[PDB]
């Protein structure tokens, strides 16, 4: 009779939102809080900022022209209690409601919270089916394994949804077209140009507020290039398609310097807050192929990213929470060091990932996972700072897909439940797959010395410390072994020279 008090928070920036889909637009409230709470809990990228608060402008905008009656509480307004919470309340009191409608969020903290709040009408909380796997599915497909292995859950999901299904059986003849040949880029190729979004009118008004506003949160906003409404969302959506996923496959793991996007899709930032849809853009992809665009290699292997890896850290954040956030399975105690803020670094690789997120707040998978990822494991900082940093720079950043990716995947903090093996590497494989090396200032054929590229003690010391542990893992063989028929002389001086480096560094 009174109506409902619909949430919708800076994520969710969907019409097809479960919190919106049966709402009664004569009666109903729409409730939006731009929320300092939210916004220093870390203290995001400046483009992070600008990206959620003006496609949730925007998202108002759009709901009030189909009719909804949207209470919409600014950052400026100087009755803004600051939390979700707070706002919650006062939207209570101003008129009367029969209960309050939210789609459960992405940070376990914040769900945990808004689920005990002691509200005088009821709150009825319905799950996020934007995605394509619930939380309930998943934890029945995890039920009684021993280890949970993505593939197996990739085919899972390639059977439900029927995407590069032929009939029962997959596309090809094989599930996955992984290759094991990926190499850097070839001297001549360079790049093509990405498109990038030129600030509208009510992402300008945020830029100004945002850089007065927030002048100590990390990162630049000139050249802010986001898309922050579906319309520009489906422009770079649309060039990704067309113009870069037929080579898709073929770069995926190269790093090139200076040049933090090259085939890549750059939707992340988009499809977090929900301004594209997963299913859709897996269709358009798989349409690319059966049209004859694109090579079924490469439109395999961006699916398998959206329906395969971010369903799954997304099932794995649910599942295991709250412990997971918990666990230091390598009992890391450092500090991060200084250059992963000010890219104050003679490490070249490492410069350019910390210059591409200050300038970007972007930087494609492997370099977050085998630059600045991997060197933070083989150094031992402290789980909890390195999530820091992690959320903090890259738009992309919520901890539900951020926290599985480097707990797990890049650091091993979570002892193995994300990516089976650590993902340890020397300066070698940076070398193999950039062309970052000729250009640094250390040695990557050398381990000692002041010359030696950093990674490479660093990585030994790695193995050599957790020796025991990663033996009976299984997937780390041939490196226990090399280390086996290395004298004691040879390992007493790298480890000297990894304890020199974590000192010079600032971890210890
Ligand atoms: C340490 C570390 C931290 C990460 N933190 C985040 C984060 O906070 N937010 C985030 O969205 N991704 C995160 N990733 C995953 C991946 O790096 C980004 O999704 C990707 O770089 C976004 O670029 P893109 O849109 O150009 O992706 P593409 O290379 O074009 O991939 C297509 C899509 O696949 C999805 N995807 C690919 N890899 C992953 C993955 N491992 N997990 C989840 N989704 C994936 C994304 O939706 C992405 O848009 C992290 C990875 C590592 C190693
Ligand atoms: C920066 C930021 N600001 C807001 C905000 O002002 N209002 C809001 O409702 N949500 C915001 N968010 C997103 C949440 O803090 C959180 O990460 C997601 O809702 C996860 O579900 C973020 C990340
Ligand atoms: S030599 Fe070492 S520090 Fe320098 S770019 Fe190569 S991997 Fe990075």
């Not at 190729?189 to 945020?206: A, K």
């Not at 040049?259 to 299913?279: E, V």
């Not at 926290?403 to 890049?410: C, D, I, L, Y």
């Not at 020397?426 to 970052?436: F, L, T, V």
Request: charged share 25%; net charge neutral.
């Amino acid at each position: 009779m009174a109506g409902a008090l619909r949430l919708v928070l800076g994520d969710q920036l969907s019409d097809n939102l479960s919190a919106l889909v049966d709402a009664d637009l004569s009666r109903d409230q729409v409730l939006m809080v731009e929320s300092r709470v939210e916004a220093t809990a870390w203290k995001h990228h400046k483009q992070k900022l600008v990206l959620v608060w003006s496609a949730m402008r925007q998202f108002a905008e759009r709901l009030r022209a189909r009719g909804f009656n949207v209470r919409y509480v600014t950052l400026e307004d100087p009755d803004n209690t600051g939390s979700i919470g707070g706002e919650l309340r006062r939207a209570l009191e101003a008129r009367a409601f029969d209960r309050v409608i939210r789609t459960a969020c992405g940070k376990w903290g914040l769900e945990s919270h808004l689920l005990s709040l002691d509200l005088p009408v009821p709150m009825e909380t319905r799950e996020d089916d934007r995605f394509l796997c619930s939380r309930a599915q998943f934890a029945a497909w995890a039920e009684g394994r021993r280890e949970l292995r993505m593939e197996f859950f990739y085919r899972e999901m390639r059977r439900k949804t029927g995407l590069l299904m032929d009939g029962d059986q997959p596309a090809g003849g094989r599930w996955n077209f992984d290759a094991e040949n990926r190499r850097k880029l070839p001297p001549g190729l360079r790049p093509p140009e990405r498109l990038r979004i030129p600030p509208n009118p009510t992402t300008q008004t945020v830029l100004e507020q945002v850089s007065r506003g927030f002048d100590d949160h990390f990162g630049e906003v000139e050249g802010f290039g986001w898309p922050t409404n579906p319309d520009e969302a489906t422009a770079i959506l649309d060039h990704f398609i067309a113009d870069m996923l037929p080579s898709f496959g073929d770069w995926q793991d190269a790093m090139s310097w200076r040049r933090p996007f090259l085939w890549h899709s750059l939707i992340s930032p988009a499809l977090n807050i929900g301004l594209l849809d997963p299913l859709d853009i897996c269709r358009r992809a798989e349409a690319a192929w059966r049209e004859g665009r694109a090579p079924l290699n490469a439109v395999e292997g961006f699916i398998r990213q959206i329906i395969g890896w971010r369903e799954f850290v997304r099932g794995i954040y649910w599942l295991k929470m709250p412990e997971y956030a918990q666990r230091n399975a390598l009992d890391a105690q450092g500090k991060l060091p200084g250059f992963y803020w000010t890219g104050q670094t003679d490490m070249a690789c490492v410069a350019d990932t910390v210059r591409a997120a200050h300038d970007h707040a972007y930087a494609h998978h492997i370099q977050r996972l085998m630059v600045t990822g991997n060197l933070a494991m083989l150094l031992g900082v402290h789980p909890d700072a390195v999530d820091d940093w992690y959320m903090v720079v890259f738009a992309d950043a919520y901890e539900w897909v951020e926290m599985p990716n480097t707990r797990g995947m890049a650091t091993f903090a979570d002892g193995g439940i994300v990516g089976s093996k650590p993902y340890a590497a020397s300066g070698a494989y940076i070398d193999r797959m950039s062309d970052y090396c000729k250009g640094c200032r250390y040695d990557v054929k050398k381990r000692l010395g002041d010359d030696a590229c950093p990674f490479n003690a660093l990585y030994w010391d790695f193995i050599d410390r957790h020796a025991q542990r990663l033996a009976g893992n299984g997937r780390m063989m041939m490196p226990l072994r090399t280390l086996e028929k290395m004298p004691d002389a040879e390992r007493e001086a790298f480890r000297k020279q990894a304890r020199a480096l974590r000192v010079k560094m600032g971890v210890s």
